[PDB]
PDB file of C-alpha atoms in Angstrom:
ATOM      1  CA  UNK I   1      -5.956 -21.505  15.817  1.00 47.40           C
ATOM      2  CA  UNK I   2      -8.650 -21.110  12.747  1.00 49.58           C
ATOM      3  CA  UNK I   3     -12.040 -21.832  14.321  1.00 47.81           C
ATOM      4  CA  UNK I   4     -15.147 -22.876  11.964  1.00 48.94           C
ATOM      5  CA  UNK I   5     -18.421 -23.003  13.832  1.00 51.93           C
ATOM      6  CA  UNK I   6     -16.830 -22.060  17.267  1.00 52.56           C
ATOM      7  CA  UNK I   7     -14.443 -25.344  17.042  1.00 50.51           C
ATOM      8  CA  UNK I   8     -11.319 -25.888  16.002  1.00 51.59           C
ATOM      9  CA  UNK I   9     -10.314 -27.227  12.492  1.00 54.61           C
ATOM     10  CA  UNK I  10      -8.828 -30.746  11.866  1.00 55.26           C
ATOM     11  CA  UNK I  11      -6.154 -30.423   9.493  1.00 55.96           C
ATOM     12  CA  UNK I  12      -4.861 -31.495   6.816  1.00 55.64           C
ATOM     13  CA  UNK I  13      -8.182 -31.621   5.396  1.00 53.71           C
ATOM     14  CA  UNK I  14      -9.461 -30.557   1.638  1.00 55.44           C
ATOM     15  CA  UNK I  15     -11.254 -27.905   1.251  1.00 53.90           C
ATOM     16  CA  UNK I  16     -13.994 -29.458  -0.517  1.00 57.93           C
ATOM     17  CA  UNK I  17     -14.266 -31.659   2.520  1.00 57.04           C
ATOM     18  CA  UNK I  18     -14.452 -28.529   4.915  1.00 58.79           C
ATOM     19  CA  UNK I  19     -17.087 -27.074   3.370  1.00 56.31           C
ATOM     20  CA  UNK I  20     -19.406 -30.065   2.971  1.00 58.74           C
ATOM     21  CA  UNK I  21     -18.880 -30.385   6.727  1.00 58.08           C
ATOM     22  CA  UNK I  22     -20.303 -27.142   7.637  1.00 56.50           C
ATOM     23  CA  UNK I  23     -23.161 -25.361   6.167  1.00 53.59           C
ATOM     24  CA  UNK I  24     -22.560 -21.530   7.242  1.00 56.38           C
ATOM     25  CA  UNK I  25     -19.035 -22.351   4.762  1.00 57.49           C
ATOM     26  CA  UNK I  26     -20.831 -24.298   2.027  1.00 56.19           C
ATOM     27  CA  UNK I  27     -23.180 -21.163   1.948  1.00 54.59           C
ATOM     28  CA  UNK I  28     -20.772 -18.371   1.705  1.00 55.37           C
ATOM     29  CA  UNK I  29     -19.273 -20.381  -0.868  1.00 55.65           C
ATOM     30  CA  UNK I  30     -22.701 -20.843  -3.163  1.00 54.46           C
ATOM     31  CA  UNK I  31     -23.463 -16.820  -2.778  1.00 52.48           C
ATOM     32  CA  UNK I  32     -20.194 -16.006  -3.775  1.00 50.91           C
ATOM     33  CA  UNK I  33     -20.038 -18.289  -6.480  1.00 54.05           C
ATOM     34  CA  UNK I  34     -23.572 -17.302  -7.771  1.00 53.55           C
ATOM     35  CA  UNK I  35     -22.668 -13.405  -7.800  1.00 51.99           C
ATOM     36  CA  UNK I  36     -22.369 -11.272 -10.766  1.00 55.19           C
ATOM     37  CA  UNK I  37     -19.116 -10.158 -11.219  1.00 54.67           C
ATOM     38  CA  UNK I  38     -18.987  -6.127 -10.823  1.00 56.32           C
ATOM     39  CA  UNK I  39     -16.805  -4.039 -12.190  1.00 56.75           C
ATOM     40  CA  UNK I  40     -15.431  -1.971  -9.778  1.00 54.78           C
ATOM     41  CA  UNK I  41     -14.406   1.559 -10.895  1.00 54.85           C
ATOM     42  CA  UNK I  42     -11.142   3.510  -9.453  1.00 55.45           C
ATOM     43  CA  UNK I  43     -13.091   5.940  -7.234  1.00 55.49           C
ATOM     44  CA  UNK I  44     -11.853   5.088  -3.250  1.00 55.03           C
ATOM     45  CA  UNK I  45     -10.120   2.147  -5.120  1.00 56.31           C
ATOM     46  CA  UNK I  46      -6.845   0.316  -4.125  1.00 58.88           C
ATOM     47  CA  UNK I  47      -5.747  -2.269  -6.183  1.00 61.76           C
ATOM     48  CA  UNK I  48      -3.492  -4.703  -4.859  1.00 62.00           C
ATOM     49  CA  UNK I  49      -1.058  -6.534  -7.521  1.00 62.33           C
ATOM     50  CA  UNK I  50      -0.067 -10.488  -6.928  1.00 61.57           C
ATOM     51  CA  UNK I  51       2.410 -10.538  -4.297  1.00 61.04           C
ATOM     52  CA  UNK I  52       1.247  -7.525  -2.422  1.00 60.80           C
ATOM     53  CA  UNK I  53      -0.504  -6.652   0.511  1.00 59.75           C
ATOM     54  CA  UNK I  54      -2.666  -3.458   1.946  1.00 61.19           C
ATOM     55  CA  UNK I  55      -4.454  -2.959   5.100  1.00 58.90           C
ATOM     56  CA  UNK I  56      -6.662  -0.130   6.892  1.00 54.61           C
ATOM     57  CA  UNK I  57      -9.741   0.717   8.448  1.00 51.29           C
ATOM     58  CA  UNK I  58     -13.118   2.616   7.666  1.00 48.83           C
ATOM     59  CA  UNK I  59     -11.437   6.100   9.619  1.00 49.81           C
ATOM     60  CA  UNK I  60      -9.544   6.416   6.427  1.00 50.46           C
ATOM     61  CA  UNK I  61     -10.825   8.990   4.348  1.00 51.00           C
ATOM     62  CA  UNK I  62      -9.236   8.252   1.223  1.00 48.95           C
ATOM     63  CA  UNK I  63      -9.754   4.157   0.442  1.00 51.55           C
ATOM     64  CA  UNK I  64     -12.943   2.467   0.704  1.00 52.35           C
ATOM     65  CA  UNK I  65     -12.371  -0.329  -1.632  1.00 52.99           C
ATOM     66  CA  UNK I  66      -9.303  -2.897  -1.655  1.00 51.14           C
ATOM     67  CA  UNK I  67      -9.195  -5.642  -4.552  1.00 49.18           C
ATOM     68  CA  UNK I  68      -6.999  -7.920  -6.610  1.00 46.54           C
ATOM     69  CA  UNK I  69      -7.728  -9.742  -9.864  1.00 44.84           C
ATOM     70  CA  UNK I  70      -6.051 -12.095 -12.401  1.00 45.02           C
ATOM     71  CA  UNK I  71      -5.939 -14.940 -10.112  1.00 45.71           C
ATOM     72  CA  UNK I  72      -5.491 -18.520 -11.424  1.00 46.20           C
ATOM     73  CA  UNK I  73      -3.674 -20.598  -8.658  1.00 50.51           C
ATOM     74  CA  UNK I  74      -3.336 -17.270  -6.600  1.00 52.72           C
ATOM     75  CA  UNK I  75      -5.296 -17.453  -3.225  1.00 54.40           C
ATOM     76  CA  UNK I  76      -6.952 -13.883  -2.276  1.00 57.36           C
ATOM     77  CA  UNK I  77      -6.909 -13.501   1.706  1.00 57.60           C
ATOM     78  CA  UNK I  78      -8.772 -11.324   3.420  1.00 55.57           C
ATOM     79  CA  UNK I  79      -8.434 -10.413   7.058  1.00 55.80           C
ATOM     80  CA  UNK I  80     -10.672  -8.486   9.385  1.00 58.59           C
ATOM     81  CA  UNK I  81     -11.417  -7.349  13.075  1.00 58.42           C
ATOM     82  CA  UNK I  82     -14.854  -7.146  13.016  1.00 56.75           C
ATOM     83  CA  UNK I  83     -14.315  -4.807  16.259  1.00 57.81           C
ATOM     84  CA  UNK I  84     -12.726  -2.161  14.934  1.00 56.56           C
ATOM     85  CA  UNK I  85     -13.042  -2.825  11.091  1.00 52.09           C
ATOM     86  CA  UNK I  86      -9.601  -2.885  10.238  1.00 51.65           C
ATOM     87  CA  UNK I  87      -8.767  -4.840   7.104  1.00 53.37           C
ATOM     88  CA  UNK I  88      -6.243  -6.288   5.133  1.00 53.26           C
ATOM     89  CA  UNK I  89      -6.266  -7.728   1.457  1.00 53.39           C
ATOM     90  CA  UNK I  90      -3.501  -9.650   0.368  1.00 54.10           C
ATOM     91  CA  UNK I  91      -2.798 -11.768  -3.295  1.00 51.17           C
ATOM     92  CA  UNK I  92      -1.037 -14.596  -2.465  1.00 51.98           C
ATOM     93  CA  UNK I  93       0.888 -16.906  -5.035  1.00 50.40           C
ATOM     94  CA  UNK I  94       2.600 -19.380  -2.558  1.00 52.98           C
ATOM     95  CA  UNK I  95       6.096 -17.288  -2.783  1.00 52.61           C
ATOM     96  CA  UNK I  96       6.631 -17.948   0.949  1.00 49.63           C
ATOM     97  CA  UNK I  97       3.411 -18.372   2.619  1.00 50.00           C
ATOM     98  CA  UNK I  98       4.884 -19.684   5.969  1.00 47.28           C
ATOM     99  CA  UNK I  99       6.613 -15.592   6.107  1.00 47.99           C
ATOM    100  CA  UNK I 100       3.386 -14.026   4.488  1.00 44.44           C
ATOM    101  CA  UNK I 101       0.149 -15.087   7.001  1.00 46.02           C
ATOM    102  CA  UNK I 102       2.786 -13.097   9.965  1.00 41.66           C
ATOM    103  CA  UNK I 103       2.562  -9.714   7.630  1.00 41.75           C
ATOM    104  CA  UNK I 104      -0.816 -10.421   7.295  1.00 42.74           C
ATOM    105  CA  UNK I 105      -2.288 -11.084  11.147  1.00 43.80           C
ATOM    106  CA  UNK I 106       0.780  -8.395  12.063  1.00 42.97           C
ATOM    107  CA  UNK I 107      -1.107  -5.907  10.113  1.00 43.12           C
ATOM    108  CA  UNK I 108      -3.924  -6.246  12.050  1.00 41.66           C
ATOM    109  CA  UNK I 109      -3.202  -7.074  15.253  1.00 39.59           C
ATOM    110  CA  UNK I 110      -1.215  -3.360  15.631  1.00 38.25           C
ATOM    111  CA  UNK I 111      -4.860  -1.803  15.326  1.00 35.56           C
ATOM    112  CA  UNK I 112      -6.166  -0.707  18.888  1.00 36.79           C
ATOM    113  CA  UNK I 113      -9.683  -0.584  20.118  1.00 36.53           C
ATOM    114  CA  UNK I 114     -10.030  -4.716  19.574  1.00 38.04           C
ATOM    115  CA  UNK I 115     -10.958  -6.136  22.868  1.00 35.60           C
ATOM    116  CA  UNK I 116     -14.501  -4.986  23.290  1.00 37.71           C
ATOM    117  CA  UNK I 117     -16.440  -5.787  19.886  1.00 38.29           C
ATOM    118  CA  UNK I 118     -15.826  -7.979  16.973  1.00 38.70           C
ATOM    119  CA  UNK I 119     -13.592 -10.729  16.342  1.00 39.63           C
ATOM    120  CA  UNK I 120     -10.744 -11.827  13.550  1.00 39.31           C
ATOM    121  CA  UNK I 121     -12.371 -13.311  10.191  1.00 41.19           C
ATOM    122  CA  UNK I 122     -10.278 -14.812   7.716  1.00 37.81           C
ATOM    123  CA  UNK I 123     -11.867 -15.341   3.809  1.00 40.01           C
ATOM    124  CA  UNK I 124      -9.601 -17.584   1.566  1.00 44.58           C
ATOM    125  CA  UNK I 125     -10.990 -17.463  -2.397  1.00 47.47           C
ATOM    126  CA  UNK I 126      -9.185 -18.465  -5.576  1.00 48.35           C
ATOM    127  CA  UNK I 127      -6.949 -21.026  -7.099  1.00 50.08           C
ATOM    128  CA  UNK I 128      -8.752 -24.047  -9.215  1.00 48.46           C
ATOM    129  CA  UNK I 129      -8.336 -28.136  -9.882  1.00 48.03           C
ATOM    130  CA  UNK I 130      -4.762 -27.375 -11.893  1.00 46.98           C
ATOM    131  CA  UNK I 131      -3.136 -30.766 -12.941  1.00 48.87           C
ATOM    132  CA  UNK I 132       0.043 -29.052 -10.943  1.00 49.97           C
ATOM    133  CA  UNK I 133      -1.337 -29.231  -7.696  1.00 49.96           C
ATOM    134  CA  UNK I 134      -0.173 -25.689  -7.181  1.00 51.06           C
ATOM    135  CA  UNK I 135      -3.523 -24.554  -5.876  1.00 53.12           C
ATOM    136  CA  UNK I 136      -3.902 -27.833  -3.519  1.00 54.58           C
ATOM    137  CA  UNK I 137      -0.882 -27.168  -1.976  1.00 51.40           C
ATOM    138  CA  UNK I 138      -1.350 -23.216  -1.589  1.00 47.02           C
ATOM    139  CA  UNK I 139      -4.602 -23.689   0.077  1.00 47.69           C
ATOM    140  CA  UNK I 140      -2.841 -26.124   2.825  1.00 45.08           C
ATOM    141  CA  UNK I 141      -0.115 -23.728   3.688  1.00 43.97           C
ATOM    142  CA  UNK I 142      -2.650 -20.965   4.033  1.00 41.19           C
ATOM    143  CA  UNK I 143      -5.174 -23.362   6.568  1.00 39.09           C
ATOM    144  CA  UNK I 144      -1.738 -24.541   8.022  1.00 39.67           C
ATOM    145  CA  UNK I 145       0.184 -21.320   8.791  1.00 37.80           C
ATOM    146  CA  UNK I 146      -3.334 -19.547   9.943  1.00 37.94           C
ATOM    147  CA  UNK I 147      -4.052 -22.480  12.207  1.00 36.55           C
ATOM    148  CA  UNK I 148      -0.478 -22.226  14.030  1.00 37.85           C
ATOM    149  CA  UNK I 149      -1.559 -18.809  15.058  1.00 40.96           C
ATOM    150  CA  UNK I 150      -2.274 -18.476  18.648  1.00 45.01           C
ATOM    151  CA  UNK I 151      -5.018 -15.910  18.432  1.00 43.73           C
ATOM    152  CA  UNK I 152      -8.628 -17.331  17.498  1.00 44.74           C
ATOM    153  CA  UNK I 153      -9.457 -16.623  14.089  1.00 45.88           C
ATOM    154  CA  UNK I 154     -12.547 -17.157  12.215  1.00 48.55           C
ATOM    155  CA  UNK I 155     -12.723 -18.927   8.787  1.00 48.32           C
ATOM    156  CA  UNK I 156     -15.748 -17.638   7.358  1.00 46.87           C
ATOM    157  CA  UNK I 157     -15.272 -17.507   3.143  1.00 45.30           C
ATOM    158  CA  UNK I 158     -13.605 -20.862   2.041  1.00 46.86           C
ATOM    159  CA  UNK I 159     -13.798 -20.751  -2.161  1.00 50.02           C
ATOM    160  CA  UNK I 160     -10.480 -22.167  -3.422  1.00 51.52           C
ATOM    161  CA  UNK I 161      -9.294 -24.627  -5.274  1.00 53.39           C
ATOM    162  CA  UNK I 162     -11.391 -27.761  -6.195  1.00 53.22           C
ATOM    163  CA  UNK I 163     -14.562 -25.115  -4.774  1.00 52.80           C
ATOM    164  CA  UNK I 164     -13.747 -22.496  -7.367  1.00 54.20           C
ATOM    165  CA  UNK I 165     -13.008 -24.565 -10.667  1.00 54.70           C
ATOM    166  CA  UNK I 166     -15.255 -24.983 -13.792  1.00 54.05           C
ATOM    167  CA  UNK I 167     -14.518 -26.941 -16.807  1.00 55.29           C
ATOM    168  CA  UNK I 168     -14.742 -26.578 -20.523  1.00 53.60           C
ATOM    169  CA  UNK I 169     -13.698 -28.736 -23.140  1.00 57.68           C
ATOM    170  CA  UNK I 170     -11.920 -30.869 -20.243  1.00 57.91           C
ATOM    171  CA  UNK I 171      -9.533 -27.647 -19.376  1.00 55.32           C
ATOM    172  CA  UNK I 172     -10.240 -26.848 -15.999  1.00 52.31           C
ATOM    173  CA  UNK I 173      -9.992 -23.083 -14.673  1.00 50.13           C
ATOM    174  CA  UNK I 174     -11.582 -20.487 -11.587  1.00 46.64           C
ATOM    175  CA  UNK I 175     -14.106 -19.397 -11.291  1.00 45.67           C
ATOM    176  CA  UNK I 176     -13.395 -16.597  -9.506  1.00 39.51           C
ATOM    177  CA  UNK I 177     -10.416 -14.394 -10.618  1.00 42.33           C
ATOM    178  CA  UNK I 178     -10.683 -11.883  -8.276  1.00 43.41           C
ATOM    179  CA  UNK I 179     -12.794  -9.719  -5.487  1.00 46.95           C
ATOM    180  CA  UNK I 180     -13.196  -6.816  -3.523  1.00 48.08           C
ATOM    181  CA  UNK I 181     -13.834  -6.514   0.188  1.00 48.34           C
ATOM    182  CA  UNK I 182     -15.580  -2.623   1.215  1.00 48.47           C
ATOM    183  CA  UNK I 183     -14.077  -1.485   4.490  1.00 50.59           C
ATOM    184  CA  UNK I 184     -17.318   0.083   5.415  1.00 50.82           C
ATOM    185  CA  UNK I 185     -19.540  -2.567   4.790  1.00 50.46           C
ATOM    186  CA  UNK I 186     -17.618  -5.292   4.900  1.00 47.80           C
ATOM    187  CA  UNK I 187     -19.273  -6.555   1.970  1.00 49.03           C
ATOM    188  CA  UNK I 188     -16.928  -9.381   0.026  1.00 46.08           C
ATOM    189  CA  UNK I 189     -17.992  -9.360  -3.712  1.00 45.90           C
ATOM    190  CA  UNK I 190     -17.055 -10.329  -7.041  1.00 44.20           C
ATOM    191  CA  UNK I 191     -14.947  -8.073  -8.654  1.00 40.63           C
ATOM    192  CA  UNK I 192     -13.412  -6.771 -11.652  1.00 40.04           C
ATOM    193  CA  UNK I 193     -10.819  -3.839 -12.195  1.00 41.01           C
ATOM    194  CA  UNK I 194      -9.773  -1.780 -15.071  1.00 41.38           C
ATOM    195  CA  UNK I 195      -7.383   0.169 -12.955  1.00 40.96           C
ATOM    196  CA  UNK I 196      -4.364  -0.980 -11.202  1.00 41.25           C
ATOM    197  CA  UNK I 197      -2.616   1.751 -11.104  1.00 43.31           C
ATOM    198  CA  UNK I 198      -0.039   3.709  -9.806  1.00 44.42           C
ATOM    199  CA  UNK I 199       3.212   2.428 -11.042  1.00 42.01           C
ATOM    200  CA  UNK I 200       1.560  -1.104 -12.690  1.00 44.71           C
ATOM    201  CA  UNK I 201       4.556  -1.460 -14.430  1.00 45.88           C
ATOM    202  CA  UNK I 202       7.012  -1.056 -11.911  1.00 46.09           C
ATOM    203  CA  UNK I 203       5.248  -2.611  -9.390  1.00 44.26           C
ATOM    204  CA  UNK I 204       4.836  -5.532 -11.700  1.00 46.76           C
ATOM    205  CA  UNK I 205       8.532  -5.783 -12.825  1.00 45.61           C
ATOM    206  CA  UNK I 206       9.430  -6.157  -9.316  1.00 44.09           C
ATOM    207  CA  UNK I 207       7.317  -9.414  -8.621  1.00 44.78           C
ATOM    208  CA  UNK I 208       8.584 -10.627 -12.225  1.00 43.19           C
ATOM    209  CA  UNK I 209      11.822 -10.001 -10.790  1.00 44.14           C
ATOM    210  CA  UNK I 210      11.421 -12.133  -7.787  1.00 43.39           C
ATOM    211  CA  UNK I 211      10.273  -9.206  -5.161  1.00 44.77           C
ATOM    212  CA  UNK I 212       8.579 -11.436  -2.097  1.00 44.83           C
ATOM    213  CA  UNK I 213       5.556  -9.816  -0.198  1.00 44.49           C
ATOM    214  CA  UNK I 214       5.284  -6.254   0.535  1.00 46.33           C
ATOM    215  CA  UNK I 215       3.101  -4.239   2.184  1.00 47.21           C
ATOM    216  CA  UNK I 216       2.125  -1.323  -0.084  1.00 41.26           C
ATOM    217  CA  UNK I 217      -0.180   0.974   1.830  1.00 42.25           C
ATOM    218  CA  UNK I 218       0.513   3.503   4.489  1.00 42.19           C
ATOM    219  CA  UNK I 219      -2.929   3.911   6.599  1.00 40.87           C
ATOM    220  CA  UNK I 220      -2.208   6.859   9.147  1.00 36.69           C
ATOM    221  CA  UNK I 221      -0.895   9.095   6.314  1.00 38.85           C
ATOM    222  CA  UNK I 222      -3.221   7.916   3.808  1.00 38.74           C
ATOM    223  CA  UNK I 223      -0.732   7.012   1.499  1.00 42.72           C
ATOM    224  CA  UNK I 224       0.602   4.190  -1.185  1.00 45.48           C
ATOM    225  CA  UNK I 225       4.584   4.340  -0.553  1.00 43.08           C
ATOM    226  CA  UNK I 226       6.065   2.754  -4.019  1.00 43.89           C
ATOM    227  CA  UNK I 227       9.962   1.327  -3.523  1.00 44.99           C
ATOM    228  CA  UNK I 228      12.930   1.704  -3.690  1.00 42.91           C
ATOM    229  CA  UNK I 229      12.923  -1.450  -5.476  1.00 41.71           C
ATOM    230  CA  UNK I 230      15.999  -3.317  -6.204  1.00 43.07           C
ATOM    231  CA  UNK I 231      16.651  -6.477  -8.906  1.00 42.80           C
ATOM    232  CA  UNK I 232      19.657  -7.382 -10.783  1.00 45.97           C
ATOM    233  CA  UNK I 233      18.904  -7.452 -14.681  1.00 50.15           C
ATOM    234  CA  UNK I 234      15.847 -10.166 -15.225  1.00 50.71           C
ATOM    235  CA  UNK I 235      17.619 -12.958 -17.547  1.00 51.15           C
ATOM    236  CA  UNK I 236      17.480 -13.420 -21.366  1.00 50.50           C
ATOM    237  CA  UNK I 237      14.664 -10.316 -21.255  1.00 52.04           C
ATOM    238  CA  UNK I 238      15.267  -9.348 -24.646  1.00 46.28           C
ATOM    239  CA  UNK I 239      15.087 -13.346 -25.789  1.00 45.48           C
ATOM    240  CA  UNK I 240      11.435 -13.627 -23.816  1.00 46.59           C
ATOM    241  CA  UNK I 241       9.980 -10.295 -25.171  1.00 45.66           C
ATOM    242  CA  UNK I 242      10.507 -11.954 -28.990  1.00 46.65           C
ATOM    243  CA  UNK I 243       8.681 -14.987 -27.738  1.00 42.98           C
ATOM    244  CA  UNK I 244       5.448 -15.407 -29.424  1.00 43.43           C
ATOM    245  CA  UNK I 245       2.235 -15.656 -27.077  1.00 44.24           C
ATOM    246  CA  UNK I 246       2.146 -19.562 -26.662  1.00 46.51           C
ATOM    247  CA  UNK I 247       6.037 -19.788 -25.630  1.00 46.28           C
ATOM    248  CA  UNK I 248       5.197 -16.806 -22.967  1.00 46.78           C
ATOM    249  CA  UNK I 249       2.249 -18.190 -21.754  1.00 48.84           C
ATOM    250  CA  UNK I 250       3.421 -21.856 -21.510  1.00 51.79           C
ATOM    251  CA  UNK I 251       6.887 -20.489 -19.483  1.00 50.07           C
ATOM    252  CA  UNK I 252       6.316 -17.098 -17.631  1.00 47.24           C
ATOM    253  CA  UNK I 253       2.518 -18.504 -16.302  1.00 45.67           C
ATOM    254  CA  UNK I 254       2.411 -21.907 -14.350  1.00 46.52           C
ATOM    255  CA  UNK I 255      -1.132 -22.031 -15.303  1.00 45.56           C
ATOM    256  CA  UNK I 256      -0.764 -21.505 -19.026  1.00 43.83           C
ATOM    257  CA  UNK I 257      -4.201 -22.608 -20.201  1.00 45.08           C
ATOM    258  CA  UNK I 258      -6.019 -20.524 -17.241  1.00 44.18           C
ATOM    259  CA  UNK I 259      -4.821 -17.266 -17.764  1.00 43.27           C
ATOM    260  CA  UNK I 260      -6.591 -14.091 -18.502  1.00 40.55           C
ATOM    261  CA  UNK I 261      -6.741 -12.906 -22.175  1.00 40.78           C
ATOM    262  CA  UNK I 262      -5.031  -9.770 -21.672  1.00 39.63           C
ATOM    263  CA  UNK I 263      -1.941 -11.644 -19.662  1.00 38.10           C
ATOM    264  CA  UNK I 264       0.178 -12.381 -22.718  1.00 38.12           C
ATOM    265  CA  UNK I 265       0.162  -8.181 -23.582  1.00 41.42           C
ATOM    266  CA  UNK I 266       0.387  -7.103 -19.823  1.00 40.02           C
ATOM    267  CA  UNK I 267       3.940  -9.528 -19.408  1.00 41.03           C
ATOM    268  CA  UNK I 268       5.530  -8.129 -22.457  1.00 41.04           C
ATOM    269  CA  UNK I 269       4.583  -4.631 -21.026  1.00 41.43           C
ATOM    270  CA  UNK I 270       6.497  -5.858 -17.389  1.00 41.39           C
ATOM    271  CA  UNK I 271       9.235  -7.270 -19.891  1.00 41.40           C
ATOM    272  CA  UNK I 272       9.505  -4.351 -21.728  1.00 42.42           C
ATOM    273  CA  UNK I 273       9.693  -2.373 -18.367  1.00 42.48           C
ATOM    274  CA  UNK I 274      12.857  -4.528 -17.008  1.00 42.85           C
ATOM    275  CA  UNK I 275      14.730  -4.512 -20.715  1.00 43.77           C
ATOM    276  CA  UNK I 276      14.308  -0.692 -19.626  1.00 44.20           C
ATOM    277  CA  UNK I 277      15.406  -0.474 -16.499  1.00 47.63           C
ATOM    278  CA  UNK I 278      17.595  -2.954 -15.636  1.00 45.95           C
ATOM    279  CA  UNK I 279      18.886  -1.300 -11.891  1.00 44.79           C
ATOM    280  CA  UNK I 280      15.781   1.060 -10.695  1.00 43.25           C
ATOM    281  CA  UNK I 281      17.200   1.394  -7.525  1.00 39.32           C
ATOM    282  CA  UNK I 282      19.491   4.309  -8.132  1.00 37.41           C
ATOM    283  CA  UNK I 283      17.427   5.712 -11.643  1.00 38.60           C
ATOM    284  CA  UNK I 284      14.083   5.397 -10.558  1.00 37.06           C
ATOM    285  CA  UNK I 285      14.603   6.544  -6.845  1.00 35.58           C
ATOM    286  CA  UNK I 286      16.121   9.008  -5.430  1.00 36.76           C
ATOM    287  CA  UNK I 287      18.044   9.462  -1.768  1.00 36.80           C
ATOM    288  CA  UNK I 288      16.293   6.058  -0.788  1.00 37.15           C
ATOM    289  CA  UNK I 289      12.842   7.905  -1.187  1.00 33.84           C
ATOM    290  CA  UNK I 290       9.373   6.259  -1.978  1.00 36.38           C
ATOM    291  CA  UNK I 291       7.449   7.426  -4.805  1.00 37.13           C
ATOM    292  CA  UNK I 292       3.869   8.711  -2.877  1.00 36.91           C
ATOM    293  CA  UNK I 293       0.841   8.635  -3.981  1.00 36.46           C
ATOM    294  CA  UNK I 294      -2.359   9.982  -2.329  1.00 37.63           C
ATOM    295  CA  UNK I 295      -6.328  10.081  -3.429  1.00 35.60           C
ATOM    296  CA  UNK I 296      -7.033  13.478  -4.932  1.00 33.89           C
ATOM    297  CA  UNK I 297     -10.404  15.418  -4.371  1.00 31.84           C
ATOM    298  CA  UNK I 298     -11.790  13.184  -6.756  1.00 30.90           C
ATOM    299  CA  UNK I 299     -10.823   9.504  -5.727  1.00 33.20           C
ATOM    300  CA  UNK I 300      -8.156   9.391  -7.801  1.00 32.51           C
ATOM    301  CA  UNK I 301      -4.214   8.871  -7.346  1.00 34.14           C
ATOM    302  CA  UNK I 302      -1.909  11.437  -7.297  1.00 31.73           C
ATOM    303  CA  UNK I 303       1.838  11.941  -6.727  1.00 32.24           C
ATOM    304  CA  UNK I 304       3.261  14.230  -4.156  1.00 33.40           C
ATOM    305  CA  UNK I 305       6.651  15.625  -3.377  1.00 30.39           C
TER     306      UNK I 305
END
């Protein structure tokens, strides 16, 4: 079950109300909040895309950082064992949250060395007051499908929804688009990121394309493990791509007003990708294989074989 102050949570219940009820919350939420947003360079870096998930722990010698970004209704989870430090950053969108919170407590409940120190900590930020209710409801699933867990986890970072929106000229957005957690540390901080790299594009066209959750990291070999992917041609692609902005943002975003300014340009890039390749799985793949990628001497991504 989720546990707040060593007692279980009474749900459904808002967030907003959650927080006010429990200081140690409404405090983690005002820090975070209040932070500068830093912008986090690619050095140890992995960058996890909407709809993806990574985990590991601070014996890996090649990631210290995990972090998303661009999120508008999109709830960032973060799970740790305090124990052994194993960690797992996911950017969810409320595809099929009931199937994702399993990857997530699967990924680290397979790490060893648990029982003696530490416990599980859960941190939920993102999403804002959208007139869809898209955020509202995302937020319940995630308190819902964590709370039918048996194991006892911790909800220490609650920032979502009506807790991360700001208003101007009576459009409402987040606050916070997006953070990074250090596996070392710990730390959970406002973030920014400027690479999201390897394969953005592909890995992008296969969320446009309807991909569901996927776990995109490989911790004992050190090692982001891209595809095979596989989509049927995304519909009326050519049609979309001679959209202007406003048509894109108001149909391919379901938060058209809250969106990042670069979103417009980096969905005709994904577009452009599928008018390209309408069947990767035999083109951009070959015998089945993953494309891998591994941090070079100098923190940056590299393919291999």
């Amino acid at each position: 079950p989720l546990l707040v102050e060593g007692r279980r949570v009474r749900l459904p219940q808002s967030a907003g109300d959650l927080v006010r009820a429990h200081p140690p919350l409404e405090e983690r939420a005002r820090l975070l909040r209040g932070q500068s947003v830093q912008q986090v360079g690619p050095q140890g870096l992995l960058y996890v895309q909407q709809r993806e998930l990574a985990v590991t722990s601070p014996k890996d010698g090649s990631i210290s950082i995990l972090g998303s970004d661009d999120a508008t209704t999109c709830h960032i989870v973060v799970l740790r064992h305090t124990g052994n430090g194993a960690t797992c950053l996911t950017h969810c969108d409320g595809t099929d949250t009931k199937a994702e919170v399993p990857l997530i407590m699967n990924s680290i409940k397979s790490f060893s060395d648990h029982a003696q120190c530490g416990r599980l900590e859960v941190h939920l930020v993102g999403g804002f007051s959208d007139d869809r209710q898209l955020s509202q409801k995302l937020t319940h699933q995630l308190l819902s499908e964590f709370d039918r867990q048996e194991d006892d986890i911790h909800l220490v970072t609650l920032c979502v929804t009506e807790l991360n929106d700001r208003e101007e000229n009576e459009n409402h957005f987040p606050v916070i688009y997006g953070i990074a957690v250090n596996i070392k540390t710990a730390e959970i901080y406002r973030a920014s990121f400027q690479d999201r790299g390897p394969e953005e594009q592909l890995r992008a066209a296969r969320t446009l394309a309807g991909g569901p959750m996927i776990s995109i990291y490989d911790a004992e070999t050190e090692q982001l493990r891209i595809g095979p992917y596989s989509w049927t041609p995304f519909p009326h692609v050519d049609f979309w791509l001679h959209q202007d902005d406003k048509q894109i943002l108001e149909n391919l975003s379901t938060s058209p007003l809250a969106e990042p300014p670069h979103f417009v340009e980096h969905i005709r890039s994904t577009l452009m990708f599928l008018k390209k390749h309408p069947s990767p799985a035999h083109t951009l793949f070959s015998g089945n294989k993953a494309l891998l990628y591994k941090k070079n001497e100098d923190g940056l991504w590299e393919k291999i074989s």
